[PDB]
Design a protein around this nucleic acid. Structure first.
Lengths: 58, 65
DNA sequence: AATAATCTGATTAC
DNA sequence: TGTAATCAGATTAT
């Protein structure tokens, strides 16, 4: 059993897309700042970027 | 580029983690979350620990074979 | 130099 | 769906 899929809101997604434009590989401080800003865990942020790098590469 | 500092597990947390690994190498979300409570580690660190644990297991086996 | 953290590439599951 | 979650495998780097 997997954790239940997070459903990112559009305001959350906008914050993450803007950060992605600054860097596709944010460091720990940047990922934690974002998590705090979006009420998400650094882990979900890390996974969003991982998947967002995938799609872009694909 | 800064990464998260290495987390250091206590002998107590390490014992709890390995005994869980012995019961199960692919702990579901509930298990990992339970483990997190017991040990006081975040579940994110637990998932990473199991990942690295399964990899130590695989490397040892290939090595000795 | 052992292993926590990060990445990609495939894949699952919803 | 498209995409969030997971995994193995490889690697970085404390």
């Amino acid at each position: 059993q997997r954790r239940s899929r997070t459903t990112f809101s559009a305001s959350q997604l906008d914050e993450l897309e803007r950060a992605f434009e600054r860097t596709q590989y944010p460091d720990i401080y940047t990922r934690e700042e974002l998590a705090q800003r979006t009420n998400l865990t650094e882990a979900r942020i890390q996974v969003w970027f991982q998947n967002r790098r995938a799609r872009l590469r694909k």
